[PDB]
Amino acid sequence: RIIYYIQAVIPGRAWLIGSNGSTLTVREGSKIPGYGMVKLIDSLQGRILTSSGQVIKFSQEDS
């Protein structure tokens, strides 16, 4: 399916890139396709919590 990776994160926003190359930016309450509703943006440690229980991170060899 599609996998999203953190490109940049500040307090408040997060810029994500997908495996198709599309880029998005999100805030605390926002819609993400295929993942659900954003519950918490943690600027430290690079973790994004999602309503489906998933955590959005950096690519492992690109981080």
Partner: peptide, 10 residues
């Protein structure tokens, strides 16, 4: 340096 609230969407 952190910004209060959320930054605007560009």
């Amino acid at each position: 340096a952190a910004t209060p609230g959320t930054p605007p969407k560009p």
